[PDB]
Amino acid sequence: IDMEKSQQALVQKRHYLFDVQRNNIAMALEVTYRERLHRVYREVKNRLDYHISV
């Protein structure tokens, strides 16, 4: 009986795995976002800088 109760509570707490998966996906996309921003900004910076060099 006690084992049944305990595994029932485990089943209750089950969701954590899926939630971690979603968290991963979400902020993976987010920091992809932010690095793309960095990429464009840095590229334009370099493009404009090789004219000050000249």
Partner: protein, 62 residues
Amino acid sequence: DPVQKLFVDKIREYRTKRQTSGGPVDAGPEYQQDLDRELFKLKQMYGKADMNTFPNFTFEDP
């Protein structure tokens, strides 16, 4: 201020430089080759992109 001959001398010679600068004066081929090499190293450090092309990355996803 003008009494010092050297100051006025440099002044007038630079004036002449300015007027003769209607185009840059006394390049000499050495000038061109030096330009070539230094621009070459500069672009090679930077890249092979155009002078003024506004590019894009054409992003993607995982």
